[PDB]
Amino acid sequence: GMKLERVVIVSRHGVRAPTKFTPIMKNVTPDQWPQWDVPLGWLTPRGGELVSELGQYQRLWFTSKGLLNNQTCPSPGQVAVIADTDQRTRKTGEAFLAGLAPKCQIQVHYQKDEEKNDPLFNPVKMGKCSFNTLQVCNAILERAGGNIELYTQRYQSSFRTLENVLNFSQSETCKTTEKSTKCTLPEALPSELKCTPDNVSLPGAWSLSSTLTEIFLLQEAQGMPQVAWGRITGEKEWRDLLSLHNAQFDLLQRTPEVARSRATPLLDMIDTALLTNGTTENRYGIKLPVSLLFIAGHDTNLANLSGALDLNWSLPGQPDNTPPGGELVFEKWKRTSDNTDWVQVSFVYQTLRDMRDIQPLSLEKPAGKVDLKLIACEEKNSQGMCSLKSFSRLIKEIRVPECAVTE
Amino acid sequence: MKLERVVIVSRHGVRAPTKFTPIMKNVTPDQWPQWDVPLGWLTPRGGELVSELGQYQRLWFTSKGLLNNQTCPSPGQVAVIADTDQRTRKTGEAFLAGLAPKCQIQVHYQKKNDPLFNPVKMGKCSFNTLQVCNAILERAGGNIELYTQRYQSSFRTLENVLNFSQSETCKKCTLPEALPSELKCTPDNVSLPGAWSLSSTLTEIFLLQEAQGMPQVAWGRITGEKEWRDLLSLHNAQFDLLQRTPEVARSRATPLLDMIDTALLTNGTTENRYGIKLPVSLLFIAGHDTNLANLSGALDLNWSLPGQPDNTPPGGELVFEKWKRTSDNTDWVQVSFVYQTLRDMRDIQPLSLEKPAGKVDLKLIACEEKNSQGMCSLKSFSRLIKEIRVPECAVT
Ligand SMILES: [Cl-]
Ligand SMILES: [Cl-]
Ligand SMILES: [Cl-]
Ligand SMILES: [Cl-]
Ligand SMILES: [Cl-]
Ligand SMILES: [Cl-]
Ligand SMILES: [Cl-]
Ligand SMILES: [Cl-]
Ligand SMILES: [Cl-]
Ligand SMILES: [Cl-]
């Protein structure tokens, strides 16, 4: 019937320590933050272990569909891995192979100038690729309703939950302020968009909240004994908290005017990997095609791909829309009856509970999987898959030619 | 006329669909747009739309003297009850975000589970399955096929919106023919599995898509208010049979009827399940469309909402006002339905006394003593609830 011929996975790095630890973070709560023994922003051994569980699940799943032969190690030119220059992405590539193909010595490709940036993951740092600053800020602004304050009103109760979790009213930030209403984060730290030719940000209570709520998720996924000082009660409060993080990523990374430019190199790689019958990747030295191309990036990249392709989703049991180790999976299926090629898009992830418990993954106890819909495709299957040329042509429409990586 | 107490029973705000099934995929060749919150959960925008109703009510209740022109309400003036679902809890919070922003008023709920909103499902009482099914079948015109005949054009409009002809299900085909409907009554639930159940769910999905402000609503194939009305008549007709039929409605609405009664009649009691000290000036209750239908059926309240195709729309509020006549110190009850038009939901229209929310003036026919302007007497209102309530379904 339907045979799986090729897969491209764009994965967020696994569980990591917080990206920063600042005076503001310390002064928005009377409590002390739990410390992490790895440096800020690094993948933890537990983060690696959770990615290996996905690697293990994907080995079993790809083998059951015939993508990889049921042998000890995949054949030469079947599996290739690309990672961004950070330790977190590089060790996610390592960790994924430890699950997928342990003791096979498969290489993790990455740029060896480890000081500099890899444009596949961050093209707007190239000279050729810059944002039209007014167009981009205004586009994000109109997605927020015309003013950030209206976007803040939309998420009021979420900010109340974050404030309750931090015990914000009793922090140094609310020391001097006394009024009829509550001391609040948005009033203490008003948010306003900042757009430059190579970057977009929303500093204030919005950026801070995005960071803090992600830290709570990371604490939980890491298996830390005291998450958010024991003050998060059930999925409702988890999603109140992570709605702030998900909404900030929506504005800064899924807004088409930003996502199109930033997702272009990854879209070009995905397209090439699914289409060609013989090519040599020039920057890493990978002989495409391969049966499985695994790409280790960040949540920013998943959000850029989501916004560019117009993919919308929610992950059962996982409050972060772009969670640690979350995989956007592009599958090339061949219909046997006419040898026509079709593309299926999925999001493979672990629930927060399965991170917390380090749930062993298999075909019996599978990883979470959400079927994604590429609605803009012209030609579709009876089973919802985009045709190969419809998939490729959608990539042509959305891509920004100035943001291509021609090195 | 002095406004002294108010009870609001509200449907939760705009939410994602409650389910996503294979039949939903197979009745159209197109793909359904995905949502970015879990199935059945309130969207942030749904929360904002409810807060606009909270703002409107703050302005309206302040002008009428119920609440004081003040930053936050005084103790024991505003209380909130919500069902255990996230969508109702969030609706309570969103409502307070508009009524009393940053005042830290609590949303009460049981720590799907609360029998105030579902007394039959939780097992307080049960339906006599034959009596309920018979009452429904008589309202259907004898059977489900006869009811189908009364909504043929509506089914044709839905099939056109779905492009049903080119669907996996058809491979001349129609929804009622391809998916025959049959009534199912069990001790805790009634349903219409088949084309009726499906159509009731799909047409609500289109309304939620539109109210959510999605770019592609029903693949852009819902043309004119006439087609909106035709589509949601299927949704509304289901809720009429399955939720407004008195044999269903009176049982399911009993806990809410008792709460409304107690909130408007007492002089002082600490309510025993949520721990609310009644009376309050405003009691807000966050329920579902099924609850509004139950109350509507039990109280024999019929309404159509100008500009709003769903009779039990997102954020729709059944409002019970206790008015005092200062002439002879007589207490009177007034019933209204407050809501937002479908366009105002899509545009997120700021509400105020200048730009008011939709409002339908309702009248309780069955009460004995009545005002010149149709209000029931407080004593008669309590008597009416005593007559229509089903004691076995009390929570209490
Ligand atoms: Cl600290
Ligand atoms: Cl660790
Ligand atoms: Cl970039
Ligand atoms: Cl403040
Ligand atoms: Cl920032
Ligand atoms: Cl960001
Ligand atoms: Cl679909
Ligand atoms: Cl929203
Ligand atoms: Cl007051
Ligand atoms: Cl019930």
Author numbering:
A (entry chain B): 5 to 411
B (entry chain A): 6 to 116, 120 to 179, 186 to 410
Give passages from the manuscript.
The structure with a disulfide bridge engineered between residues 141 and 199 was refined to 2.3 Å spacing with two independent protein monomers in the asymmetric unit. The engineered disulfide between residues 141 and 199 crosslinks an α-helix and a coiled loop of the α-helical domain and has well-defined electron density indicating a highly successful introduction of this new element into the phytase fold. The major domain on the right is composed of residues 6–28, 47–135 and 260–410 and is colored blue and grey. The rmsd in ∼380 equivalent Cα positions is 1.18 Å. The four disulfide bridges can be seen to be totally conserved. All the variants showed similar activity levels in the standard phytase assay and essentially identical pH profiles. Furthermore, very similar temperature dependencies of activity are observed at sub-denaturational temperatures while the high temperature activity drop associated with irreversible denaturation is shifted to higher temperatures as the number of disulfide bridges increases. These results suggest that, while the engineered crosslinks do enhance stability, they do not cause dramatic alterations in the native, functional structure of the enzyme, corroborated by the 3D-structure of one of the variants. Indeed, the effects of the engineered disulfides on thermal stability appear to be roughly additive; for instance adding the Tm enhancements (relative to wt) found for the single variants (2.2, 6.3 and 1.3°C for S1, S2 and S3, respectively), ΔTm values of 8.5, 7.6 and 9.8°C are predicted for D1, D2 and T, while the experimental Tm enhancements relative to wt for these variants are 9.8 (D1), 8.2 (D2) and 12.1°C (T).
